Structures are given as structure tokens and as C-alpha cells.
Amino acid sequence: RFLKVKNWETDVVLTDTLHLKSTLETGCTEHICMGSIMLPVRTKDQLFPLAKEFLDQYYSSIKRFGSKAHMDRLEEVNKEIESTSTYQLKDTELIYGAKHAWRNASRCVGRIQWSKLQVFDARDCTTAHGMFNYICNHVKYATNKGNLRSAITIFPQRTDGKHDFRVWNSQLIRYAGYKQPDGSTLGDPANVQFTEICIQQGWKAPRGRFDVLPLLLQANGNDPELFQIPPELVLEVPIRHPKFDWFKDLGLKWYGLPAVSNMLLEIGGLEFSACPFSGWYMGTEIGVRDYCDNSRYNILEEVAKKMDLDMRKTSSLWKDQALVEINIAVLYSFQSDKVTIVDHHSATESFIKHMENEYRCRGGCPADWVWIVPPMSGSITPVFHQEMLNYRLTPSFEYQPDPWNTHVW
Amino acid sequence: RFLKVKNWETDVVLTDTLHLKSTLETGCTEHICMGSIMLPVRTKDQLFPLAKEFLDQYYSSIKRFGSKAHMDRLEEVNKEIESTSTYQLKDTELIYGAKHAWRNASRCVGRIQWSKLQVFDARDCTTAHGMFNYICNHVKYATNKGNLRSAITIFPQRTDGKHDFRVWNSQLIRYAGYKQPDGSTLGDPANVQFTEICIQQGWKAPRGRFDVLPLLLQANGNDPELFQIPPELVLEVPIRHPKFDWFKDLGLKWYGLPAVSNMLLEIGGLEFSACPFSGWYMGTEIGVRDYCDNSRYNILEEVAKKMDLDMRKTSSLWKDQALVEINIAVLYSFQSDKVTIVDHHSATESFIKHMENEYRCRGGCPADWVWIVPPMSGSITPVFHQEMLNYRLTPSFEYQPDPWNTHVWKG
Ligand code: HEM
Ligand code: HEM
Ligand SMILES: C[C@H](O)[C@H](O)[C@H]1CNc2nc(N)[nH]c(=O)c2N1
Ligand SMILES: C[C@H](O)[C@H](O)[C@H]1CNc2nc(N)[nH]c(=O)c2N1
Ligand SMILES: CCSCCC(=N)NCCC[C@H](N)C(=O)O
Ligand SMILES: CCSCCC(=N)NCCC[C@H](N)C(=O)O
Ligand SMILES: [Zn+2]
Structure with a gap:
């Protein structure tokens, strides 16, 4: 029931108890691990226990669990669901919910920032x-x-599913x-x-x-x-390299604001199907994934050619050499234009500190290792060496x- | 049931039926994934079915399932277990078993080679x-x-656990x-x-x-x-760099032969507690992990110092640049000395071909993505983009x- 996670670089062992509050399913079973798979209306009956669970967590967080105000809110929500088949969150509850959906996001390396989220109520x-x-x-x-x-804008919740x-x-x-x-x-x-x-x-x-x-x-x-x-x-930021004069001639640029717009925010059983949210980039997102994925802008070959690398043999590591240079250019270009960006060393260092805080204060931190480890230079970042438990807590982004x-x- | 895995780079979708043959457990549940956790005397009663399922697998593989030789062998093992509490594998079965433990090793990126294994019977x-x-x-x-x-040497199996x-x-x-x-x-x-x-x-x-x-x-x-x-x-191989003449003066070397000696081989319920096996290195094992882990030889700073990289801020990517140069040097050194080594691009490309072949001929290929993806330049190798299913088949290394x-x- 109490689970241990070990860091293999430092030998620090942490104990996870938060996973017992886990609601949704993982896709894994005792027989098969689906940890690397990308993608693995609520009746009156279904809705009240979800509202209760959320309200309980909320009242706990402000140290008023079991109070008059807690019991009166639960009654008010119960009455509202019985009468209207749904209910409405108080602004305080919506802000708490959105922040915790971020806090619970097991795939996000940037959660040290979780309590500093600006919430725009667009209900x-x-x-x-x-x-x-x-x-x-x-x-x-x-x-x-x-x-x-960091910001989120939250539009009206699902009703009958037709609107x-x-x-x-x-x-x-x-x-x-x-x-x-x-x-x-x-x-x-x-x-x-x-x-x-x-x-x-x-x-x-x-x-x-x-x-x-x-x-x-x-x-x-x-x-x-x-x-x-x-x-x-x-x-937008034009991409140039601090040493390679020719890099700017590739005609690359990227945008400064990463804002995910197709996810669903679940809070207390309610479903917010349009809830765009944004932070700032980690450089490998652009330089490794968007630029070097074969099914994306796929620029490795062109850059390697400009560097005059030996491209005859995989073992010269020409792809790895060009990759580092592309990622150097992304970070330099964003920093020179004073656009917020984080490198993977600094971001992962932060997440480790966040994970330690969360273990001490909350009893754990759900984390998906497959997503948290950067897509370049994995083992030279501290998260590679860190065991992580993945589980699904609500409120959640789905x-x-x-x-x-x-x-x- | 059928399970599907997708490659997000090619959109190739494979279907797994082999997972239905898995009996052992993973550590995961419907509520928790333990995918990144490093480590998550048998009775006669438990021993005969394990024997039987193994011999059924062996006899099917040789297209002799349900033959007189198959039935006679089951009877022989059953009688051997009833009277001695254990049994002895035939040489052929032991070879088949060791080859299959390798085929089944979900953490091994080199399994394209599984059918080429020299088995030394040291029982x-x-x-x-x-x-x-x-x-x-x-x-x-x-x-x-x-x-x-590639080779394995197999010492006598466990008896009472005291020998x-x-x-x-x-x-x-x-x-x-x-x-x-x-x-x-x-x-x-x-x-x-x-x-x-x-x-x-x-x-x-x-x-x-x-x-x-x-x-x-x-x-x-x-x-x-x-x-x-x-x-x-x-x-052993002295490490030098094709362009940087100062690299040799770091005084680095590594051994050519990587041979894992502390794992247990399970075949048909029998436990081979001493079963050293060896292949050849993938260069990142030495250049990324053995040399560059903070808790291992930890050479990144020294290499970056010699390259005169800007080390004041991590965002110059100095660790990343030195990392690539070290890995270039490892591959160059081994190749120059004619010692077998494979780069992480070659190895992962071959593994994807092996995996696709396994899906087609065997109905699956269990694989642990956390281990399969190399510790540098992950997403520029095709395995990063490949969904994998991890499950435990026997025979196995444990x-x-x-x-x-x-x-x-004893004293
Ligand atoms: C403040 C700076 C932030 C940083 C540096 C950061 C970092 C990251 C990174 C690198 C990823 C992986 C994205 C990918 O590979 O496609 C990610 C995913 C994710 N992040 Fe963040 N994040 C930040 C803010 C936020 C905020 C503000 C939220 C919600 C309010 C959030 C929630 C999520 C979620 C739900 C995912 C998974 C997205 C998906 O599955 O495609 N993050 N984060
Ligand atoms: C022929 C060349 C081979 C290559 C290139 C190769 C490649 C690899 C690599 C890179 C790893 C990860 C090692 C680590 O991170 O510590 C690994 C693990 C493993 N390989 Fe291989 N392998 C080969 C041969 C073999 C052989 C001959 C066997 C057994 C007969 C085998 C069975 C395994 C097992 C059981 C593991 C997991 C080890 C552990 O959990 O510590 N492999 N392989
Ligand atoms: C198949 C595999 O799950 C897939 O390629 C994942 C791996 N890790 C990832 N990690 C992050 N942060 N983002 C991703 O898109 C992916 N893709
Ligand atoms: C905690 C984590 O599972 C651990 O650092 C793993 C990650 N992936 C690995 N992959 C390989 N091939 N070898 C390893 O030692 C590890 N270590
Ligand atoms: C918005 C929640 S996470 C914070 C922003 C971010 N760092 N990434 C969002 C995904 C961007 C995508 N990977 C891309 O490369 O464009
Ligand atoms: C022997 C079974 S796998 C084939 C050999 C191998 N490529 N590595 C074994 C582990 C070596 C360890 N990572 C090291 O860096 O010393
Ligand atoms: Zn799992």
C-alpha cells in the first residue's frame, strides 16, 4: 500500500502514499504495462460523489473540513444537482480546481510553477x-x-453534451x-x-x-x-546561432507562446471542454521535436550538410552533433529576444526539487517518466535516474x- | 484479445496477441504504473505445470507437438519430478531455453541477434x-x-536453495x-x-x-x-578522439567484453542462479552512462574544460556538446581497434526491424521503453516514437x- 521510489544517482528513497487517493485508471494491468502508449453526460447518480470528493478536498485545503460552511456547501450542491442535474463552481473552487489539475498533470515537467497560474473565468x-x-x-x-x-481561460462547462x-x-x-x-x-x-x-x-x-x-x-x-x-x-522569434553565421539563412522561426487548446478540464465531476492553457517553452520541444522529428520540420539533414559533417556513417554521430547545435540556436535566439524559455537541464532540476516538495507536503507526485525525461541527453538530466509512479488524480486535464x-x- | 501499438513517426500499427501467453506479473495495476521502477525451493505441485508449459513450447517450436516423443518426454519429466522433486533438461531444451530467455528479455535492445547464441553447458x-x-x-x-x-555459460541449477x-x-x-x-x-x-x-x-x-x-x-x-x-x-581499448589529440591524455580506457553475471535464468520452472552471458557494447553504455553518470566516472566537466565550452550557464548546452564528443571517441576507439561495438542509431534501427518481424511471426515482442530508448538523443532514434508493450514471458532472465x-x- 505504501510505495517506495528510489533515485539511482543519489540513493534518496521517498515514500508515496498519495497514489491511494487515485481515481481514474492507467491502462496497465498486473499482466501488461502500457506505460509507453500515448492514448491509453454524468448522470445525477454519477455526479454527486464526484462533487463530494472535490468539495472535501477543497475544504481540507483551507483547513475547514467538517465545518458548518463545508456541510452547508455540500447540501447546497446536492440540492442543485437533484434539482438541475448539474451544479456551478464558486470562483474560489474554479481557481483551486484549475491549479490542482496542473498540479496533477503527470506529463508536465513544469509543475514547480503550479500555484502561480492566472485563471481567467470565461463561464x-x-x-x-x-x-x-x-x-x-x-x-x-x-x-x-x-x-x-502562465494562464488558463475557462469557458462554460458541458451540459447535455449537445452544447x-x-x-x-x-x-x-x-x-x-x-x-x-x-x-x-x-x-x-x-x-x-x-x-x-x-x-x-x-x-x-x-x-x-x-x-x-x-x-x-x-x-x-x-x-x-x-x-x-x-x-x-x-x-515570434527568428532562429540564429551564436557561432554559425549561416544558421539564420535556413529561414527558421518559431512562436513564443505554447498554449494547449484541445484538452478537457475535469473539476468535481464537471467537464470544461474548452479551457486553453499556456506556459513557456522548454527548448527541446522546438529544437528536438518540432524541428528534428522526421514527421515534423525534419531539418537534421540540411543542418548537418551546412556543418560539413561526415554523413556516410551513423557512427560518426552527425545526427547527434547537428541536434545539439539546433538546440543551442533555439535557446540563444529566445534568450537574445528576451522571450522566456527554459533549457532541459534547468527544467528537470526544478522538477526534481518540486517532486521532493510534493513528497514531503502531499505524500507524493504522479509523474510519467516517458514524458518527463527530455527527448535529448536523457541520462545527463536528473529525472532519468529518478523512479516515478504514474497515477491519475482529479481534478485533471484529459x-x-x-x-x-x-x-x- | 488484440492489443494495438502505434509508431507515431510512421503511423504503422501492429497488433499484439503474444501478451496472452504472459503469466508472470509486472508491478503495474489498473491504478498505478510502475514502468520506471528498476526492480519491481519450488514444490512438486507448482513445478509440473511449469515443466509442461515449457515442454509444450519446445515441442511446438520443433513441429513435434503431440508426437510420441513429446508425450514420452512429458511422462519422463513427470516421473522424474514425482521421485526426485526436480528434473534435468536435455541439451537441446537447455539451448532452446537460453535462446528464448534472451528473445523474451524486454530490456534488451540487441535481440535481433537472439537466435545466434553460443550455449556452454557447464552443468x-x-x-x-x-x-x-x-x-x-x-x-x-x-x-x-x-x-x-554472443555466449552464455550455464552452471548447475538450484536444488534446495542451500547449494x-x-x-x-x-x-x-x-x-x-x-x-x-x-x-x-x-x-x-x-x-x-x-x-x-x-x-x-x-x-x-x-x-x-x-x-x-x-x-x-x-x-x-x-x-x-x-x-x-x-x-x-x-x-581493453584506450580511448582517443578522431579530431581532438588531447582526448587520449584523459587516460581513459574500457574493456571490450560486457558480460552480465548476476542474473537468474528460469527455464521450465528450473532456476539457473549462475548463468553469465555476454554480447557486445552499444557505445552509449560506456560513453553516456559509464563515463558521464555523476555517480560513475563523471568526466563531463573535465572534457568540457578541454573543449573550452562556455560552462557558466547550462543553456549553452555544454554538457550535451561534451557528451556527443565522448561518445564519438568511444565508437572511434573500438572501431579503430577492431573491437565489435554498435552505435545507438544502428542498434535501435535494427531493433525496430526485429520488433516488426516478431509481431508478424510471433504475435508480439515485449519491450520496456524506459530501457530500450538510449540515454542520449532519444527522439532522433526510431524507438522513441514506437509504442511498446511490456509483459513477462518464460523462459526469462530475472x-x-x-x-x-x-x-x-560456513567459515
Ligand atoms: C510554466 C511553464 C511550463 C513548463 C516549462 C511546462 C513544461 C511542459 C512540457 C515540456 C511538457 C511536454 C509537452 C510535450 O512534450 O508536448 C508539458 C506537458 C503538459 N503540461 Fe506543462 N509546462 C508548463 C506549464 C503548464 C501549465 C500552466 C499547465 C496547465 C495549467 C500545464 C499542464 C500540462 C499538461 C496537461 C501536459 C500534457 C500535455 C499533453 O499531454 O500533450 N503545464 N509541460
Ligand atoms: C548481441 C549484442 C547485444 C546487444 C547490443 C545488447 C544490448 C543491450 C543493452 C544496451 C542493454 C541495456 C544494458 C544496460 O543499460 O545496463 C541490454 C540489456 C539486457 N540484455 Fe542485451 N544485448 C546483447 C546481447 C544480449 C545477450 C547475449 C543476452 C542474453 C543471452 C542479452 C540479454 C539481456 C538482458 C537480460 C538485459 C537486461 C539487463 C538488466 O536488466 O540489467 N543481451 N542489452
Ligand atoms: C511512443 C512514445 O510514448 C511517444 O513517442 C512519446 C514518448 N515521450 C514523449 N515525451 C514528451 N514530453 N512528449 C511526447 O510527445 C512524447 N512522445
Ligand atoms: C529510474 C530509471 O528507471 C532508471 O534510471 C533507468 C532508466 N532507463 C535505463 N535504461 C537502460 N538501458 N539502462 C538503465 O540502467 C536505465 N536506468
Ligand atoms: C501548455 C501546457 S505545457 C506548457 C507549454 C509548453 N512548454 N509546451 C506545450 C506543448 C508545446 C509543444 N510541445 C510544441 O513543441 O509546440
Ligand atoms: C550481456 C547482456 S546485454 C549485451 C551487452 C551489453 N551491451 N551490455 C551489458 C550491460 C553493460 C553495462 N551497461 C556497462 O556499461 O558496463
Ligand atoms: Zn505500467
Whole structure:
């Protein structure tokens, strides 16, 4: 029942008890581990125990468990669900919930920051036009001219499931991708399907390498509508290298604001299907994944060629050499433009300190090792050597089906 | 049931049915994943089904399932178990079993090679001296003057648990570590506890940075005895860099033969507690882990100092740059000396081909992503993008407690 986790570099052994508060399932069984798999309406009956569990955790957190106010709130919510089949969170409960969904995010290395989240309550939003305004304001607040600030914007909860709010985009800011007659892909290959949806919905595409996608916003279950983020709100960084003069000539850039927009926020049984949230980048996200994945911008070959590396043999490690240089350029370019970015050494060092705090104060920290370890230089970061237990606590950020697969027009 | 795994780079989807043959447990539950945890006398009653399921697997593999030879063999083993509480494997079954424990080893990226394994049957061994001789012969055979050959040597199985054969070394060839009174370590910090045991047992330690450990060998449950591997049988490689002439003056070297000696082989319910096996290195094992772990030789700072990298801030990626140069030097050195080694790109590419072949011919390939993904440059290797399923098939290699924790000393 009490579980131990060991760090193999330091020999420090921590004891996890928080996993006993675990609600959702992992995908693993006693017979099979599914730890490397990417992707492994609530009735009145279903909803009250979920509200109770959340309210109990909330009242505990402000040291008023079992109090008059605790018991009166539980009764109020019970009455509301029995009468209306749902209930509404107090602003304090929504802020607590969003912060804890971040705290519980087992795949996120940046959780040391969890209590410093700005929460924008957009539950009064009714139209897609309202959504666009709120999102532009999120974008401007979070960007803060390069001094990035963590934020979430929360739109109205699911009701009967026919009036969902949804941002159809996977992040607020992403680049278009276009299948060419050539057979190659122009832009970001990850976004080819979504760009096709936008064009079919009437977006006039510039058909370039780094075209910022419009937002496709769905309010109150209505058909989604198109909006362009004001260009002057989208901060972008040209990529250059501190030593290699030729790097700038590759014509690379990236955006400053990573803002995930397709996840679902579950708080006390309630489901917030449009809840875009943002922090700041870890450099390997752009330099390793977005630039060097074979199915992404796939620039390893081009950079290796400019460096004049021996590309005849895998064992010269030309791919590894070019990888480090691309990642040096990403960090240098963001730092020179004074746009917040974290390197993987500093980010993982932080997460370790966070994990230690969480073990001492909360009895544990759910963590998905497969996601926490950076996609380059894994064992030279401290998280590689750290045993982690993965489990699902609520409030939570959850994946949900892409809306074009689900939406009836 | 069918389970699907996807490659997120190619969109190839494979279907696993082999997991249905898994009986052993993982540590995971519907509520917790223990995927990154390093370590998560049998009765007659439990022994016959394990025997039977193994012999069913063996006979199917030779297309003789349900033959008279198969039925006669089950009857023979059943009678041997009923009367002696154990049984003896035939040589063919032992070879099949060792090959399959390797095929089934979910943490091994080198399994494309599984069907090429030289099996040395040492089940006639009775003493630690005889163990020493078997192991010297394994080292010479597997080394093959640098053209490495995979091999395993199998000592007698467990009987009552009071007569176990054990190699107390974690690998056949490893370097001593010495803790100094000032708290520093000379040599390999991984091997400090074991070195202390060797010295206590009588080893005259040279006290240098790369001292090959003596073997410490336990036969038939007796107290272990020390032996030195003949120096001429221990192939080593001086480390140098193709471009940086100062690299050689770091005074680095490593041994050619990686040979795991502390694991237990389970075949058909029988337990082979002493079963050293060897292959060849993937370069990151030495260059990333052995040299660059903070708790191992820890050379990153010294290498970066010599490269004149900006070390004031981690965001210059100085550790990453020095890491690549060290790994280049390891691969270059071994290749220059004609000692078998494989780079992490080659090894992971071959593993993906092996895995896809296994899915098609066997219905699956259990694999532990946490171990399979290399410790540098993970996502530029194809295994990072491959979903894998981890489960436990028999025959298998298992961890076992260190023998100094469990040994009853006779005196
Ligand atoms: C403040 C700076 C932050 C840093 C440096 C950071 C770091 C990261 C990184 C590197 C990833 C992996 C992303 C990927 O590989 O695609 C990640 C994932 C994630 N983060 Fe954060 N994070 C930050 C803020 C936040 C915030 C503000 C939230 C929510 C309020 C959050 C919740 C999540 C979630 C739910 C995931 C998993 C996303 C997915 O599954 O695709 N993080 N984080
Ligand atoms: C032919 C070349 C081989 C290569 C390139 C190779 C590669 C690897 C690597 C890189 C590891 C991880 C080692 C570590 O991080 O400590 C490993 C683990 C392992 N390999 Fe291999 N291997 C080979 C041969 C073999 C052989 C001959 C066997 C047994 C007959 C075997 C069975 C295993 C097992 C059981 C592990 C897990 C060890 C542990 O848990 O400590 N492999 N392999
Ligand atoms: C198949 C495997 O689960 C997949 O490639 C994962 C591995 N680890 C990851 N880790 C992070 N942070 N982000 C990712 O997208 C992935 N992809
Ligand atoms: C805690 C964690 O599981 C541990 O550091 C693992 C990670 N992956 C590994 N992978 C390999 N091949 N070898 C190892 O020793 C480890 N160590
Ligand atoms: C928003 C929650 S995590 C904080 C932001 C972030 N550091 N990453 C978000 C994902 C970005 C994606 N990996 C990309 O490379 O564009
Ligand atoms: C023997 C079974 S796997 C094949 C050999 C091997 N490539 N490594 C074994 C482990 C070596 C350890 N990581 C080290 O760096 O010394
Ligand atoms: Zn698991």
C-alpha cells in the first residue's frame, strides 16, 4: 500500500502514499504495462460523489473540513444537482480546481510553477465571437511582451453534451501544413488535417512555411467559426546561432507562446471542454521535436550538410552533433529576444526539487517518466535516474476526441 | 484479445496477441504504473505445470507437438519430478531455453541477434575452480580477439536453495572502485561495495583507476573463492578522439567484453542462479552512462574544460556538446581497434526491424521503453516514437538478491 521510489544517482528513497487517493485508471494491468502508449453526460447518480470528493478536498485545503460552511456547501450542491442535474463552481473552487489539475498533470515537467497560474473565468461567454475576444486577451496577458506568464481561460462547462464549447485548434498558435503536388509537405506536417478543415471552412491560405493558423471556435454546440488572431499579438522569434553565421539563412522561426487548446478540464465531476492553457517553452520541444522529428520540420539533414559533417556513417554521430547545435540556436535566439524559455537541464532540476516538495507536503507526485525525461541527453538530466509512479488524480486535464469526428453540422 | 501499438513517426500499427501467453506479473495495476521502477525451493505441485508449459513450447517450436516423443518426454519429466522433486533438461531444451530467455528479455535492445547464441553447458561443474576454468573459456570464446560472439555459460541449477552456484561479480569484467578517507572515489564508484568484499576475502588491490576485479565464485553453496582472470584474456581499448589529440591524455580506457553475471535464468520452472552471458557494447553504455553518470566516472566537466565550452550557464548546452564528443571517441576507439561495438542509431534501427518481424511471426515482442530508448538523443532514434508493450514471458532472465545479503557463511 505504501510505495517506495528510489533515485539511482543519489540513493534518496521517498515514500508515496498519495497514489491511494487515485481515481481514474492507467491502462496497465498486473499482466501488461502500457506505460509507453500515448492514448491509453454524468448522470445525477454519477455526479454527486464526484462533487463530494472535490468539495472535501477543497475544504481540507483551507483547513475547514467538517465545518458548518463545508456541510452547508455540500447540501447546497446536492440540492442543485437533484434539482438541475448539474451544479456551478464558486470562483474560489474554479481557481483551486484549475491549479490542482496542473498540479496533477503527470506529463508536465513544469509543475514547480503550479500555484502561480492566472485563471481567467470565461463561464459567462455565450458566442464564438466572445470566445475570440477572451482568447486574444489570454494571448496578450500570457505573452506579456516576452516575459511569459502562465494562464488558463475557462469557458462554460458541458451540459447535455449537445452544447459543448470547443476550440478546434490543438494549440492557440500553430503553423499550417499543406500537402503539395510535388509529394512533399510545406509547413508543419502535424497540422495538415486541421489546415484542410480551415480551408474548407473558408480560410484563404497564404501557402507558406510558417503561416499562423486561424482559430476555429465552437460555442454552445454551434458550428465552429473562423477568426484570425491579430498578427501583432503573435510574438515570434527568428532562429540564429551564436557561432554559425549561416544558421539564420535556413529561414527558421518559431512562436513564443505554447498554449494547449484541445484538452478537457475535469473539476468535481464537471467537464470544461474548452479551457486553453499556456506556459513557456522548454527548448527541446522546438529544437528536438518540432524541428528534428522526421514527421515534423525534419531539418537534421540540411543542418548537418551546412556543418560539413561526415554523413556516410551513423557512427560518426552527425545526427547527434547537428541536434545539439539546433538546440543551442533555439535557446540563444529566445534568450537574445528576451522571450522566456527554459533549457532541459534547468527544467528537470526544478522538477526534481518540486517532486521532493510534493513528497514531503502531499505524500507524493504522479509523474510519467516517458514524458518527463527530455527527448535529448536523457541520462545527463536528473529525472532519468529518478523512479516515478504514474497515477491519475482529479481534478485533471484529459484528452478528448477531435471535434470534427464528433460534431454534427 | 488484440492489443494495438502505434509508431507515431510512421503511423504503422501492429497488433499484439503474444501478451496472452504472459503469466508472470509486472508491478503495474489498473491504478498505478510502475514502468520506471528498476526492480519491481519450488514444490512438486507448482513445478509440473511449469515443466509442461515449457515442454509444450519446445515441442511446438520443433513441429513435434503431440508426437510420441513429446508425450514420452512429458511422462519422463513427470516421473522424474514425482521421485526426485526436480528434473534435468536435455541439451537441446537447455539451448532452446537460453535462446528464448534472451528473445523474451524486454530490456534488451540487441535481440535481433537472439537466435545466434553460443550455449556452454557447464552443468557438470562441481567446484569454484571448475567455475573459474569455464568462465575463462567463455571470456576467450566470446572475445574472439575483438570479433565478439554472443555466449552464455550455464552452471548447475538450484536444488534446495542451500547449494546454489553463484558468480558474486555483477559482470565478469569490471573495474574496482575505492572510497578514499576524504570521501572521493578512485576507479568506478559502482563497484565500491563489491571491491570491499574482494579485499576482505584476500584480494591484493592495486588501487588504480582501471583495475580489473577478481572473480568471486561460489559452487554448490560453499563460501566463494577468489580468482584472477588471466590479464591476456581481458581485451581493453584506450580511448582517443578522431579530431581532438588531447582526448587520449584523459587516460581513459574500457574493456571490450560486457558480460552480465548476476542474473537468474528460469527455464521450465528450473532456476539457473549462475548463468553469465555476454554480447557486445552499444557505445552509449560506456560513453553516456559509464563515463558521464555523476555517480560513475563523471568526466563531463573535465572534457568540457578541454573543449573550452562556455560552462557558466547550462543553456549553452555544454554538457550535451561534451557528451556527443565522448561518445564519438568511444565508437572511434573500438572501431579503430577492431573491437565489435554498435552505435545507438544502428542498434535501435535494427531493433525496430526485429520488433516488426516478431509481431508478424510471433504475435508480439515485449519491450520496456524506459530501457530500450538510449540515454542520449532519444527522439532522433526510431524507438522513441514506437509504442511498446511490456509483459513477462518464460523462459526469462530475472534479477536475484546480491549473494552477500543471503549467503550462509560456513567459515
Ligand atoms: C510554466 C511553464 C511550463 C513548463 C516549462 C511546462 C513544461 C511542459 C512540457 C515540456 C511538457 C511536454 C509537452 C510535450 O512534450 O508536448 C508539458 C506537458 C503538459 N503540461 Fe506543462 N509546462 C508548463 C506549464 C503548464 C501549465 C500552466 C499547465 C496547465 C495549467 C500545464 C499542464 C500540462 C499538461 C496537461 C501536459 C500534457 C500535455 C499533453 O499531454 O500533450 N503545464 N509541460
Ligand atoms: C548481441 C549484442 C547485444 C546487444 C547490443 C545488447 C544490448 C543491450 C543493452 C544496451 C542493454 C541495456 C544494458 C544496460 O543499460 O545496463 C541490454 C540489456 C539486457 N540484455 Fe542485451 N544485448 C546483447 C546481447 C544480449 C545477450 C547475449 C543476452 C542474453 C543471452 C542479452 C540479454 C539481456 C538482458 C537480460 C538485459 C537486461 C539487463 C538488466 O536488466 O540489467 N543481451 N542489452
Ligand atoms: C511512443 C512514445 O510514448 C511517444 O513517442 C512519446 C514518448 N515521450 C514523449 N515525451 C514528451 N514530453 N512528449 C511526447 O510527445 C512524447 N512522445
Ligand atoms: C529510474 C530509471 O528507471 C532508471 O534510471 C533507468 C532508466 N532507463 C535505463 N535504461 C537502460 N538501458 N539502462 C538503465 O540502467 C536505465 N536506468
Ligand atoms: C501548455 C501546457 S505545457 C506548457 C507549454 C509548453 N512548454 N509546451 C506545450 C506543448 C508545446 C509543444 N510541445 C510544441 O513543441 O509546440
Ligand atoms: C550481456 C547482456 S546485454 C549485451 C551487452 C551489453 N551491451 N551490455 C551489458 C550491460 C553493460 C553495462 N551497461 C556497462 O556499461 O558496463
Ligand atoms: Zn505500467
